[PDB]
């Protein structure tokens, strides 16, 4: 199973580079990777397994945090209770489209390669439509909204060797955007 050990921090290369499209089918090691990204999710919401690990609770991971230089990335966000869940394993995903109108949220955003935390607001687009292959091949279509958005956006940044803080204003980092949306 991936543990923290696994998880490269900031500073290593392979966080900046661009990650490499993944061919269809995937290899046998692919999918056990793409699997073993998501099951590292679940472990670390889980409070007992979590804590015996020390993993820092999260919804999202790329190939890149386990250095794997590959377009997957794995979302799990629980049912806030509203009843919305998302359990994504993604390859090649791709935003198609988005919204003119910016979202984010208000305590800034967090990293697991990322060990002290950093300041400011990251403005991202409310809206978004995302393209993409599921671990079979098949094709998925997504169109998210809000904090999903913003989780989605995050990780499909690492793909491309962007990390959240590269967005923050060097100016008012607390200090929102003329009316982007919170949360
Ligand atoms: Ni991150």
């Known amino acids: 199973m991936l543990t923290m050990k696994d998880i490269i921090r900031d500073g290593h290369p392979t966080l900046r580079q661009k990650a490499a499209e993944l061919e269809l089918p995937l290899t046998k090691e692919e ?5 073993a990204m998501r099951e590292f ?3 670390s919401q889980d409070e007992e397994i979590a804590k ?16 794997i230089s590959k377009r997957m990335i794995a979302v799990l966000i629980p049912d806030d209770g509203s009843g919305k869940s998302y359990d994504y394993m993604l ?8 919204s003119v109108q910016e979202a984010y949220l208000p305590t800034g955003e967090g990293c697991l390669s990322v060990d002290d935390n950093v300041a400011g607001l990251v ?8 393209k993409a292959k599921d671990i079979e091949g098949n094709d998925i279509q997504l169109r998210l909204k809000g904090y999903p958005a913003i989780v989605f956006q995050h990780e499909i940044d690492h793909l491309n060797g962007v990390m959240f803080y590269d967005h923050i204003d060097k100016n008012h980092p ?5 009316d982007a949306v919170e949360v």
């Open 91 to 98: 390859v090649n995903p791709k935003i198609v489209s988005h």
């Open 123 to 130: 403005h991202r687009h409310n809206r978004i439509t995302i």
């Open 174 to 178: 607390l200090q929102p955007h003329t």
């Open 41 to 43: 999710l679940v472990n």
């Open 52 to 67: 015996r690990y020390g993993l820092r609770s999260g919804v999202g991971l790329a190939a890149p945090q386990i250095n």
């Open 31 to 35: 999918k056990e990777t793409l699997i």
